Swiss-Prot record:
The keyword Secreted applies. The IL1B production occurs in 2 steps, each being controlled by different stimuli. First, inflammatory signals, such as LPS, stimulate the synthesis and promote the accumulation of cytosolic stores of pro-IL1B (priming). Then additional signals are required for inflammasome assembly, leading to CASP1 activation, pro-IL1B processing and eventually secretion of the active cytokine. IL1B processing and secretion are temporarily associated. Keywords: Cytokine, Cytoplasm, Inflammatory response, Lysosome, Mitogen, Pyrogen, Secreted. A motif (Involved in interaction with TMED10 C-terminus) lies at residues 112-125. The chain holds residues 117 to 268 of 269 of the full protein. Expressed in activated monocytes/macrophages (at protein level). The lineage of its organism: Eukaryota, Metazoa, Chordata, Craniata, Vertebrata. Its main location: cytoplasm. One of its GO terms (cellular component) is lysosome. GO terms for molecular function: cytokine activity; integrin binding; interleukin-1 receptor binding; protein domain specific binding. This is Interleukin-1 beta. The record marks K55, K63, K65, K74, K88 as: Important for interaction with integrin. (Microbial infection) Cleavage by S.pyogenes cysteine protease SpeB promotes its activation independently of CASP1. SpeB-mediated maturation of IL1B plays a dual role depending on infection site: while IL1B inflammatory response prevents bacterial growth during invasive skin infections, it promotes streptococcal infection of the nasopharynx by disrupting colonization resistance mediated by the microbiota. Activation of the IL1B precursor involves a CASP1-catalyzed proteolytic cleavage. Processing and secretion are temporarily associated. (Microbial infection) Cleavage by S.pyogenes cysteine protease SpeB promotes its activation independently of CASP1.
Length: 152
C-alpha cells in the first residue's frame, strides 16, 4: 500500500523552533506568537528499515514540498542537506538510506540518528539563528533532543 505519513513540527529541547534559512537550509530560533507561522511542517514518513520498540526509521520530508532532509558526505564530512526529489516518486516506503533517520524515544524526548552515519544526529546550536546540522555526538554543548507537535 502507500507509505504512511504524519504532519508535524519539531522543537529542540531548549524549545527552539525550526524555520527555512534560504532554500536548502533550516535554522533554529526561539519563536512565539504570530511568528510561529514561520515554522516548517514535516511530513514524517514511516519507512523501510531496521526497527525496535523505541527506534523507528523515518524520512523527514517537508509537507506539500518535494524536499527531504538527507545525510551525505560533503568535503569528506557527514552533513545534513535539504535535497530535492522527483515529486512523482516521493514519498515512498523504500526511501534511499541518505533520507532515513532512526527516530529514537528516550526519557520523553526524540533523537534523530542518521541511518547512513551511525551516531550522527540532527543537531542545533545553543545560539539563536544558526543552521540545523548533523553532529557526531548525542553528547556535549550542541542539542540532539527534540519534541514533536502534531499538525492537522
Ligand atoms: C495542515 C497544516 O497545518 N498545514 C500547515 C501549512 C504548512 C506550513 C509549512 C509548510 S512547509 N513544509 O513548507 O514548511 C507547509 C505547509
Amino acid at each position: 500500500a502507500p507509505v504512511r505519513s504524519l504532519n508535524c513540527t519539531l522543537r529542540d529541547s531548549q524549545q527552539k523552533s525550526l524555520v527555512m534559512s534560504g532554500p536548502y537550509e533550516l535554522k533554529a530560533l526561539h519563536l512565539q506568537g504570530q511568528d510561529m507561522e514561520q515554522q516548517v511542517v514535516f511530513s514524517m514518513s514511516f519507512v523501510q528499515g531496521e526497527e525496535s520498540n523505541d527506534k523507528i526509521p523515518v524520512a523527514l520530508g517537508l509537507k506539500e514540498k518535494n524536499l527531504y532532509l538527507s545525510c551525505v558526505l560533503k568535503d569528506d564530512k557527514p552533513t545534513l542537506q535539504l535535497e530535492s526529489v522527483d515529486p512523482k516518486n516521493y514519498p515512498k516506503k523504500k526511501m534511499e538510506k541518505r533520507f532515513v533517520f532512526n527516530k529514537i524515544e528516550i526519557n520523553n524526548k526524540l533523537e534523530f540518528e542518521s541511518a547512513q552515519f551511525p551516531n550522527w544526529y540532527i543537531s542545533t546550536s545553543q545560539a539563536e539563528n544558526m543552521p540545523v546540522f548533523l553532529g557526531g555526538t548525542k553528547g556535549g554543548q550542541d542539542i540532539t533532543d527534540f519534541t514533536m507537535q502534531f499538525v492537522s
